[PDB]
Amino acid sequence: NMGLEAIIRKALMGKYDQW
Amino acid sequence: TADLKSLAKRIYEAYLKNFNMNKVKARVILSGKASNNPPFVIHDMETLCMAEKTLVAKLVANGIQNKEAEVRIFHCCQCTSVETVTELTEFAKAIPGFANLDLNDQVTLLKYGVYEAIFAMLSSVMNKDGMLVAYGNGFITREFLKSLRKPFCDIMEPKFDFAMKFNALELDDSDISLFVAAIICCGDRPGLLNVGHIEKMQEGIVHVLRLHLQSNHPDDIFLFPKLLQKMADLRQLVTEHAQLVQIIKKTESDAALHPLLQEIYRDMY
Numbered sequence: 183n184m185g186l187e188a189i190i191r192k193a194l195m196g197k198y199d200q201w
Numbered sequence: 202t203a204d205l206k207s208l209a210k211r212i213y214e215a216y217l218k219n220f221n222m223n224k225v226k227a228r229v230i231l232s233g234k235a236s237n238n239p240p241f242v243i244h245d246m247e248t249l250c251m252a253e254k255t256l257v258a259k260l261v262a263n264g265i266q267n268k269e270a271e272v273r274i275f276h277c278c279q280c281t282s283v284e285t286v287t288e289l290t291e292f293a294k295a296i297p298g299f300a301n302l303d304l305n306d307q308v309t310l311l312k313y314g315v316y317e318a319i320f321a322m323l324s325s326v327m328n329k330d331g332m333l334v335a336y337g338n339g340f341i342t343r344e345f346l347k348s349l350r351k352p353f354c355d356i357m358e359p360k361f362d363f364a365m366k367f368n369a370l371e372l373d374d375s376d377i378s379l380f381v382a383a384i385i386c387c388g389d390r391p392g393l394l395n396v397g398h399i400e401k402m403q404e405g406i407v408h409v410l411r412l413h414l415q416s417n418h419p420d421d422i423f424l425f426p427k428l429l430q431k432m433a434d435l436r437q438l439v440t441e442h443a444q445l446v447q448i449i450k451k452t453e454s455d456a457a458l459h460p461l462l463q464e465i466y467r468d469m470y
C-alpha cells in the first residue's frame with residue numbers, strides 16, 4: 183500500500199442511502 | 202447464531218449493491234452472448250490509442266495521443282481507481298459493525314486492505330486471454346501487456362497468473378463478498394486503536410466464511426484453508442506490486458499522483 187487515505191476518507195463522508 | 206446468521210446475507214447485499222461489476226455480469230460479457238456488440242478489443246498500440254483517447258475525453262484536440270504508451274495505460278487505471286476505491290469504502294461501511302470503528306480506524310482498515318481486495322475481485326473480470334476494462338466495455342488482451350517495454354510487461358502478468366488459479370477454486374459473489382470483507386476486517390493493520398473489536402468482528406466474517414464455504418462447495422472440504430492461504434498470496438502480491446510500481450515514481454516521474462488528481466477529486470463526493 184501506501185497512503186491514499188485522502189480519497190478514501192472523503193468517500194467516508196458524503197453519501198446517503200441504506201437498506 | 203441469530204444475528205451472526207443474517208450476517209453473511211447482509212454482507213452479500215452490501216456487495217450486490219456497491220460493486221458495479223461482479224462475477225456474473227462479468228462472466229457473461231466474457232463467455233457471454235445476448236449482445237452482439239461485445240467489448241472493444243485493445244490488442245495493440247493503435248487500438249490502445251483509440252481506447253485511452255476517448256477515455257480521458259480531453260484528448261482529440263489536446264495532444265495526449267502518442268507519448269510512450271507503456272505510461273498511458275498507467276493513467277486509465279487511475280481514472281478507474283477512485284471509482285474502485287470508493288465502492289470498497291461504501292461496501293465496507295455497509296459491513297455490519299464496521300461503521301462503528303472510530304473513523305480514524307476505519308481509514309486504517311481500508312488503506313492497507315484496499316489493494317488486496319482489488320486484485321481479489323480483479324479475478325472475476327479476468328480469464329486466461331485478457332481482462333475486462335471500463336465497466337465491461339473494453340477487453341484488453343493478456344498478450345498485449347506482456348509485450349510492452351520492460352519493466353511494464355511484468356505488472357499485469359503476476360496478477361493474471363494468481364487469478365487463473367484463484368478462479369479455479371470456483372467461488373461466486375456470495376463467497377467473494379465474505380472473502381473480501383475478511384481481508385478488510387483484519388486486525389493486523391499498523392496503527393489500529395481498538396485492535397480487538399476488529400478481531401471480534403473479524404471472527405464472524407471468517408466464521409460465516411467457513412460455514413458458507415462448507416454448504417456452498419461441499420466437496421472442496423479444504424477450500425476454506427485454501428482461501429486462508431490466498432488471503433496470504435494476496436498480501437504478498439500487493440507487496441511485490443508496490444515494489445515494481447516504484448521504478449515508476451523515481452524513473453518515469455511524469456505521470457505520478459501530481460496535485461492534478463484534483464480537478465474532479467474534491468467537489469464530487
Ligand SMILES: CCC(=O)NC[C@H](Cc1ccc(OCCc2nc(-c3ccccc3)oc2C)cc1)N/C(C)=C\C(=O)c1ccc(C(F)(F)F)cc1
Pocket residue numbers: 252253256271272274275277278279281282285319334335339341346349353354356357446458
Ligand atoms: C497510485 C498507486 C498505485 O500504484 N496503485 C495501484 C493501482 C491499483 C489497480 C490496479 C489495476 C487496476 O485495474 C485496471 C484495469 C485496466 N484498465 C485499463 C484500461 C486501459 C485503457 C483504457 C481503459 C482502461 O487497463 C488496465 C490494465 C485497478 C487498480 N494501480 C495503478 C494506478 C496502475 C497499474 O497497476 C498499472 C497497471 C498496468 C500498467 C501497464 F500497462 F503499463 F503495464 C501500468 C500501471
